[PDB]
Amino acid sequence: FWNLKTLQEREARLRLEQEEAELLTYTREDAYSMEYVYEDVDGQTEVMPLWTPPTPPQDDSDIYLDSVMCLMYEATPIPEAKLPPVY
Amino acid sequence: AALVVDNGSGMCKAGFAGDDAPRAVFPSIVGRPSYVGDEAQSKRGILTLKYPIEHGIVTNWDDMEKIWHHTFYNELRVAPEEHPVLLTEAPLNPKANREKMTQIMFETFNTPAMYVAIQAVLSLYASGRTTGIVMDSGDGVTHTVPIYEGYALPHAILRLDLAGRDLTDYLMKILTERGYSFTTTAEREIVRDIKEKLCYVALDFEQEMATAASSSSLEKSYELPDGQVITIGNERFRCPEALFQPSFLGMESCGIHETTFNSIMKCDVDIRKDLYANTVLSGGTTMYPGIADRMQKEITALAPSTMKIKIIAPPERKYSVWIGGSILASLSTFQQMWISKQEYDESGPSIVHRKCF
Amino acid sequence: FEEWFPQGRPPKVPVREVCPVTHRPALYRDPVTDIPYATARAFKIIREAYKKYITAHG
Amino acid sequence: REVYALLYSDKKDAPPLLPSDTGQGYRTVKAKLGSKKVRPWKWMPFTNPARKDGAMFFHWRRAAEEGKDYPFARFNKTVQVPVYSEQEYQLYLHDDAWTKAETDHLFDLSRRFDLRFVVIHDRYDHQQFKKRSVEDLKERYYHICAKLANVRIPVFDAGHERRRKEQLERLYNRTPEQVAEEEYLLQELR
Amino acid sequence: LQEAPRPKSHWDYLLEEMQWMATDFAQERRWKVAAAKKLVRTVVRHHEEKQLREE
Amino acid sequence: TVPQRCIGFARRRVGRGGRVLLDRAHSDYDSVFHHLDWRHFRPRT
Amino acid sequence: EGEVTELTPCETENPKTISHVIIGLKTAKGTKQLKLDPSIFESLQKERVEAGDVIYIEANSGAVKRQGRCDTYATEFDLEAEEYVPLPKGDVHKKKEIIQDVTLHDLDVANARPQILSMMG
Amino acid sequence: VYGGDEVGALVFDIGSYTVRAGYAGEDCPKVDFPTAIGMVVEPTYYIDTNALRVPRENMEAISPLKNGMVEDWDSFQAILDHTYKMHVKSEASLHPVLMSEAPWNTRAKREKLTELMFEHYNIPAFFLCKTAVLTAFANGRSTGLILDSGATHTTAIPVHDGYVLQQGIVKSPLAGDFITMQCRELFQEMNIELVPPYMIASKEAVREGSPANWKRKEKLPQVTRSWHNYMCNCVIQDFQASVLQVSDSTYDEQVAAQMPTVHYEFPNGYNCDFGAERLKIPEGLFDPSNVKTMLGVSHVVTTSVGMCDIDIRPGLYGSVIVAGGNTLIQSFTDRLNRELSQKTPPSMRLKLIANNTTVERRFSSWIGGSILASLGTFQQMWISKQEYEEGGKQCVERKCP
């Protein structure tokens, strides 16, 4: 019984030790030196996106998009094929 | 090993991580005709004595650099470029001073690794409790820092300008009222000694006043350095009472108990119980006898009767901040928290806000 | 008991030494000056520096 | 399967992993840190060429970077808005429905708020000038821009936008019975 | 009806940078809270271990 | 890479000082992802 | 399998007496503590296991086998070969399936002449 | 280009309850002292908590702000000076200052504030942003319906693209002060004598409902009625934080009576169980028609959005941000979310941003100010002293939208 009690007290202490946060920091190599990739079943590769601060504009290619308009309408102009003719 | 340096307004505590007590404790003062520490106080007659840390805040950064240089080279006799340095800052320190600490450590001393910790959380580490309120009273300032799960709450922090230096000046005045001579600038050190040896906190100030006026059994004698002996009585507790009655000094402010209660009340209702159960006293100005019981009775008067009050005042609370710094620097989990030289080089002195809390 | 169950402290992780001449992962250490190095040119430079320093010191 | 969020996904989210050396211990990375020394940083004044006044703010920057052009100044470029003379207005842009000072107020607001016509409408001085709908502001602005371009492109259709907003308002204001009806139709017509 | 296209203005880049900085603030606060909790519970375990070892 | 363990759902975000940070999202199956050895990213030189 | 991180015996009163020997094993995935039968103390000292050794312990027999110092403690200045091994990847506890293809003739040859009599043979 | 630039700017958010201040780049205000200050007619000003809580003869309790806007510029200067000297501990001419302002602040008041900041405090740069935009910025949202319920007003402010749509501002007088008055009335009905803690020399434990056994402090000086009212308000606000709770749905007497009572102890040792009246009081914020034409908080929300462009209403409902101290009453956010989900059109997604903590609710404007001041792209926006030399009247209204 004393051993059963001490093992339950040990499992309680281990649970307390594990409920506390496990990781807070990762290596510099992972942070900057290595890029993160994913390869699918066809062999195509995707690089993990990096949320960077805004990049300065080189030209006027940075077209503005109204994020509130996109809540009611979709972001692409309707193709002329499905557009009804001129009234 | 890591270096734990606690820079205080009156005296600096320096030492190595994991040690029980600081290896070197010396006054924080620079003397220019530059001599720092007890060498400077030995030469009052030829040096201009200035304190760089006022109310926990650095004023002259060159003096602070000189104090750190003296610490590393003469006090601990170590190379700063070999050891990580864990510094302490007073609560509500300006951001620019914390940046300057970072810059000075990396660019003048080329330290390998650095961290800046708040002094109250280190006192709480030394207490060994997760949640509590620290009432740290040093030479020049008194703070009441509530801490929940190790995260200080900056908004609820309350600061009191009353501290042991003003208590030294008040005991000097009271001794002059008894007719003893202490007004000259060196004899201030004798008032400090008699304050540290004989002063005590009254549990009930009016009862002690009446008893010491009625009976001479409460009086004690102290021998001045020149061989003269003085007897001080009633005065033995009028000085510490100024912590609880700052109107004695003419400062219209709340007492330390009232400041602690107000700082607790500034916190969330739910976490107040843990703060009341863990009221930690640190700093030299809290070393007076009976201060734990007087604080207990005052907080119990202010706090609800359904709330359990427990003042924690260990015998080592004069160094609690540095013991906590040493415990933190010796931790395995803390080793990931060091600001590295490379991090400073790539992110600048503002790295201290990104990593340290 | 303590012979059969010694409580050995886990060994310290070694210093990943670097060559002070070229800042490459250290492969060697000079027997005389006990300074690690990574190439023959580093060894020659280190020994020239050591002879100059021992001349200056005494 | 994946998660999306802006700031953070839930209160129970694990903390971010920050990079740092010495996580594997200081002793093992002692030689690397001791081999190098940091570059000096300075609290220095900087010119921002996006500002027209020339005021100098301060930075933490490396010593070698002192005096370099402010990088955030590259973002500074305004939405293109035409400018017309009094003569060009008198010749081309006159409309009995619009005062010149009213149009100048509209175009000043447009230059202020980057053609965000909802913000222009909110800031439009309806007290001094006549009350205008956002369609009226868009109509006047795009008409003037088209006319100036022609004198010196998707045209605006005020009626279509007016009908679109009126329909949206009608769809919004309807009672809960009148949306229960529509959803009951949408589910029963399937 | 499609508005006439325009490139991003200074204010658009300001609002993008604002969104990025707000994210960084929230995540840094969450990290500092969790790290403080971790360190303090480790210190409490260091004292509990010391007490159990010296007893 | 250190530890060689799936940390679960994360995103790479640049921090204030240029520091690249991994934000992490809670999931009920986080323990299963810890035992794990869908779009699943891994670092490479 | 894992790198040895602790070997603390668990003392007790007998109804020094030990009732368990706790071994902590570390792999790249994580760390596990095992509550082994005290009799495994003979095999630990026979294998001369110390902190920083990669070992493996089979569930059935309970005998430990030592396979070297973890390479995280190897320097480029010390010379040994067989005594270092990389820190194991994967979970500390592993279930391995080994499939071998043989012929009955292989078994015949093996049991007919197993491999000082061996020296002369 | 890179991370936002920190130029050592200060962020001040002076509200009617607490003055929130700190350095830009921090995630929390390093100071928050009560806005109410002590005044002695000579005037001598006692400003922070350490000074306010001690009795003084002929000292009145006043506030520089009126209806969310500063009225007494002398007390405002006193608060600013105290903030600088005690908490900031830096010269005003050395750090740029970004201050928040009410959604409805008048042009003349803005000009007066800018004139004060430049002529008196000699600051190098200045900016004045609205509290609602900063609250939105604290949450990384450029658009959304801010709902702020402090002590003075419950206000819905629609923000679109970082701009307050002033036409959609709806303000209600029901706020923390209304709750304080309601608690005062409740205490009066129950004949509880509100004894501020400063008058109590000692107290003894008593049972619930028992008369208070407390000893009055001796040698107490005469105090003004304003300071006594302020101390009573402090204890009432402690009661509000500790006891009151918003019902998860429309208040019902039977359901309220079923739920367990909550015990509170007054400073003089008096204690009681507050039963169901603790739920009735906060109900006025949602259903003012039952309080002995004000609009409920959910009606303030739904009215404010209805005054905006229907192109933007989907975004306003899609980003509802709750801020202010009065929103920290228990279950306030849940009740508000329930009511808004019940009233919102099904065709639009409604989402209340989940940040519900004291720091995130009370300091949100300051957090947004710090975020804005730390942006490199924002460094163009500052009003410089050289700009104040020419456009001291002209540009101050034009530079800060």
Ligand SMILES: Nc1ncnc2c1ncn2[C@@H]1O[C@H](COP(=O)(O)OP(=O)(O)OP(O)(O)=S)[C@@H](O)[C@H]1O
């Ligand atoms: N036994 C004692 N009893 C009471 N006061 C004491 C005692 N010993 C020292 N003091 C006083 O306590 C103070 C000790 O200084 P510290 O506590 O280190 O303050 P400091 O840390 O230097 O300054 P701060 O406020 O922390 S920045 C001095 O004012 C001493 O006079």
Ligand SMILES: Nc1ncnc2c1ncn2[C@@H]1O[C@H](COP(=O)(O)OP(=O)(O)OP(O)(O)=S)[C@@H](O)[C@H]1O
């Ligand atoms: N935790 C809490 N629970 C309940 N009420 C609270 C809490 N904290 C603060 N309050 C109340 O919230 C109000 C103050 O909220 P704040 O928004 O901080 O006021 P303020 O913003 O400084 O001034 P205004 O009115 O917004 S101009 C007071 O009525 C307080 O009593």
Ligand SMILES: [Mg+2]
């Ligand atoms: Mg100290």
Ligand SMILES: [Mg+2]
């Ligand atoms: Mg407010």
